[PDB]
Amino acid sequence: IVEGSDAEIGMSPWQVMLFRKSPQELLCGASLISDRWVLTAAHCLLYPPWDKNFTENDLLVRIGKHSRTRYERNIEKISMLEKIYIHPRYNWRENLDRDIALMKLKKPVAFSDYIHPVCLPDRETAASLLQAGYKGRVTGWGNLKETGQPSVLQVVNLPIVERPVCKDSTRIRITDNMFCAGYKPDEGKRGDACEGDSGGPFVMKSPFNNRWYQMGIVSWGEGCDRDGKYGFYTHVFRLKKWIQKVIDQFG
């Protein structure tokens, strides 16, 4: 996260770290959506142009974390993966369209003060909140600058941007399964997700029921926090039918 700040303890209790077993290192962010299911970006697990193709046994999920590098004894919980599910129409060839994956845990995780699931939006909450200018929140342990790494989880609030502005900021083909967020050059304030924040959640707090909803997944961006560029996020609601199908069939 570029130009963010340290998270408060328990501020994002659905935040998940995807951890590589060997070598031991951060692979991506992710989010907890139930006691057995974790949501992330498909490109965290599968990206052939960079020779990335992780299998279940390659990875661990670390939940309840704050420190990036410490083993947070008595606080974090570490889970093994039962199965990975990648969207069948994930477009790694072109533009990361449908950049979404689910991971089923081998065993349910116990909820605590530091571990708790986020809501997924229904159609109405999505329609109400996914509007240009409305701000969401991104969290992660990724890079602090485009070209270092944070001691603890970082957080930044960012406004959703009008679709034509998103489109005009890039040569990449944008789809309805993506949205973009960030400040414009004229707006002064800044901030962005970055490498390592991939797969983590873009959340919004509903003013109707005071619950946090995951609207986006950190997907892609041209550099990090560049003037005139925006961060792109997987549109969770647009892909919710797939999410529900996977959970209903395999959960």
């Binding site: 408060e8 328990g10 501020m11 209790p13 959506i33 003060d113 699931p117 809501c119 957080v155 003013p207």
Partner: peptide, 28 residues
Amino acid sequence: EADCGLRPLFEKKSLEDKTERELLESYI
């Protein structure tokens, strides 16, 4: 599921985090 999105250290104890108001203020 039933209590999704309600944080134990914030919503569940009626405490606000330091920047959530920024989000609310944007929901015009």
